[PDB]
Amino acid sequence: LIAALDARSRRDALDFEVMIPAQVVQYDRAENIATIQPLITWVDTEHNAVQRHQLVDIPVISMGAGGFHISFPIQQGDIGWIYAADRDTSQFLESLSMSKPNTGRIHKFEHGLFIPDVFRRYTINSEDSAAMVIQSTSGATRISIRGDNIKITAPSNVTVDTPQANFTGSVTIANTLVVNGVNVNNHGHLENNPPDARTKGGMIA
């Protein structure tokens, strides 16, 4: 009989984990690890599809290198993809350096990586149809990068916290400019004649 190896091959492929959609149960942003719940059940011999185990202490990617990175404020319930490492990563995670596997389990989500993905749960404004956006998923607060311009939109404010902000060209401000507490639109100056009289009105062309 040859059905034997067919059965084996199937079992072995089912047991070998690679990638599946998954959800955050809990997340620690300082240690950048999560408890993760896979979101596709597996059919058992009994033909019952059942919920998979949680995975603990799973690193969540923070893309970055060279002293820079991108970090999202991950919440319980957020979704993404868990990947299974070839070997136990637990010692590597302790040291972030060259390590041995502490165990013999291979190709299992238990030692994996979670990559957050919002899937389709976002809105792109029509003006950004040809742009890259880094944004709230609502689309309300965004940095939009286009081929020759950048547009930064926020319903409340944009705050630039730095000692020196430099503009190498011109600047146009639609409404009010206040500098050190003084409204420039409406400002004046003391005259020499009449002595110490403030000029009339505000700033004019």
| Range 4-23, binding a copy of itself (CB under 8 A) | 4-5, 8-9, 12-14, 16-21
Q: According to the binding rule CB under 5 A, does residue 198 interact with Ca ion?
A: no
Residue 189: name its binding partner from Ca ion, a copy of itself, none (Cβ under 5 to 8 Å by kind): a copy of itself
Minimum Å gap between C-beta 184 and Ca ion is: 21
Closest CA to 41 of 21, 58, 25: 21
Query: Does 187 show up as a binding residue in the annotation?
Result: yes
Residue 28 backbone phi and psi in degrees, to 5: -115, 110
43 belongs to the binding site for a copy of itself (CB under 8 A): yes
Q: Is 190 in the site for Ca ion (CB under 5 A)?
A: no
> Out of Ca ion, a copy of itself, none, which partner does residue 21 contact, by CB within 5 to 8 A per kind?
a copy of itself
Residues 6+ apart with CB under 8 A from 141: 135, 153, 154, 155
Residues whose CB falls within 8 Å of the CB of residue 58, separated by 6 or more in sequence, listed in order: 33, 34, 35, 36, 82, 109, 112, 113, 114
Burial class (CB in 10 A: 0-12, 13-18, 19+), 126: exposed
Question: How many residues bind to a copy of itself according to rule CB under 8 A?
Answer: 148
What span, in angstroms and rounded, lies between the C-alpha atoms of 191 and 68? 53
Rounded distance, CA 95 to CA 102, Å? 13
Pattern 135-174, binding to Ca ion, x per CB under 5 A?
Answer: ----------------------------------------
In terms of Cα–Cα distance, which of 59, 71, 51 is closest to 35? 59
Site for a copy of itself in 153-172 (CB under 8 A): 153-172
Site string for a copy of itself, 110-149 (x = CB under 8 A): ---x-xxxxxxxx-x---xxxxxxxxxxx-xxxx-xxxxx
Q: Which does 56 bind (CB under 5 to 8 A by kind): a copy of itself, Ca ion, none?
A: none
The token duo for 8 is 């084996």
Binding-site annotation, residues for Ca(2+): 191, 193
